Amino acid sequence: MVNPTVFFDIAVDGEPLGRVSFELFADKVPKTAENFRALSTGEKGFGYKGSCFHRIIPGFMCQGGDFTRHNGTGGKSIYGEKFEDENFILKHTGPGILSMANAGPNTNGSQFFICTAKTEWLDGKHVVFGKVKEGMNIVEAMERFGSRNGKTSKKITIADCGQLE
């Protein structure tokens, strides 16, 4: 199977910023990739469209995916409230890595993070499932609205999202 590609159209306080696209490594983690892909298209009736990045820490990562509570307490997977860590084949190699947020072993929902650095200390605890293809400069622009404690100075939103192929 060819690895799927998804896009996010990012807005700052409602104003278009740019497009970010991701390669999803379905050849390593098909269950995790599929979940992100489906929440990106909205085909299940719910997903990332209109959600925000509630937690951005400069030099570290941008966290999003909480489309039910918008603060880190919510979100759900296409498989149910949670699913297992599929595997840890892939590592946090550097900027652009797309990886699952969680609340301990086997608690994957819909929350994810895009790294803006190598985050090796997270290897084996967070399932890496993708990487930024185009629009790393958009991610870098998003990053600048974050702070040390994660709070954003402006509303960073996924105005639109879906699948390219």
């Binding site: 880190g72 307490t73 947020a101 929902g109 997270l122």
Partner: peptide
Amino acid sequence: XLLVXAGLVLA
């Protein structure tokens, strides 16, 4: 510290 958690954010 620098974690990416969902609910109880730790140091």
